[PDB]
Amino acid sequence: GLVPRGSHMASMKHNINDNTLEIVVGDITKETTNVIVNAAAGSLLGGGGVDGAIHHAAGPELLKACQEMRNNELNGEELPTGEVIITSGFQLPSRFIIHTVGPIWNQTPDLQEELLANCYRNALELVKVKKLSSISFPSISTGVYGYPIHEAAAIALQTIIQFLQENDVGLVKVVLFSERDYSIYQEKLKYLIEKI
């Protein structure tokens, strides 16, 4: 699966308002939060990484749902960078998948930080208004799309943290299949908490 066998397991939890932010090493396709987030492609065709794993786990109905959403909600266009759509999770233990498109590193350097942050803000706004109680995010735009992990992780955490300071959402997880990524997130979060 996404988490290499024998990876170090680890968790960190912190409350913000009556919200909770959790960082964990894990396989996001096995998360039991109400929502998980897919780091998708504009095409909403499944690829590799988290996107591939989510489609494999969710089953074939996901691709079909996504392409009709593209046809109906998006009028046949790709999902724009930073925007979101929601579908069923199908065979996933999570009820819903929010699909978002992260910026591809340095394609639009002037905009990309705001666009990556939009992924987070739009997903949380959706959770808020639909009262979905819990959501798991993966690392978005990172990889060999990739976005340097320290920079991506700063944008994610700061955006999530401010949103949780200002809103009732519930439980937000960042679920990472890499203990390397987790360690960066853990230390950065502790650093950001200290500032609040």
Residue numbers in the entry: -10 to 185
Quote the study's own text.
Macrodomains are ubiquitous and evolutionarily conserved modules (approx. 130–190 residues) that recognize ADPr derivatives in their free form or linked to proteins, including ADPr, PAR, ADP-ribose-1″phosphate and O-acetyl-ADPr (OAADPr). To expand our knowledge concerning the field of macrodomains, we have characterized Oceanobacillus iheyensis macrodomain (OiMacroD), the first to be described from the order Bacillales. A yield of 40 mg of pure protein per litre of culture after a simple two-step purification process was obtained. Its phylogenetic analysis revealed that, among the six different classes previously described for macrodomains, OiMacroD is included in the MacroD-type clade, together with other previously characterized MacroD-like macrodomains, such as hMacroD1 and hMacroD2. The subunit has a mixed α/β fold, similar to that of other nucleotide-binding proteins, composed of a central seven-stranded mixed β-sheet (β1–β2–β7–β6–β3–β5–β4) and five α-helices.
To gain insight into the structural and catalytic role of residues N30 and D40, the corresponding alanine mutants were constructed, instead of more conservative mutants, with the aim of completely abolishing the catalytic activity. Surprisingly, these mutants were active towards OAADPr. The 72% reduction in catalytic efficiency found in N30A mutant was not due to overall changes in the structure, whether crystallized or in solution, since its Tm was close to that of WT in 50 mM sodium phosphate pH 7.0. The main difference found was the threefold increase in the Km value, with practically no effect on its kcat. This decrease in N30A affinity was also detected in the thermal shift assay, where slightly lower ΔTm values were observed in the presence of OAADPr at all the concentrations used compared with those obtained with WT. In addition, two different conformations (open and closed) are evident in the β6–α4 loop (residues 131–135). Interestingly, both alternative conformations of the β6–α4 loop are visible in the same subunit of the N30A mutant, representing a snapshot of the complete conformational cycle of this loop. The best WT and G37V crystals were grown in 0.2 M ammonium sulphate, 0.1 M MES pH 6.5 and 30% (w/v) PEGMME 5 K. D40A and N30A mutant crystals were grown in 0.2 M magnesium formate with 20% (w/v) PEG3350 or 20% (w/v) PEG1500 with 20% glycerol, respectively. G37V and N30A mutants showed cubic (I23) and orthorhombic (P212121) space groups, respectively, with 1 subunit per a.u. In the case of N30A mutant, 11 well-ordered residues belonging to the His6-tag were included in the final model.
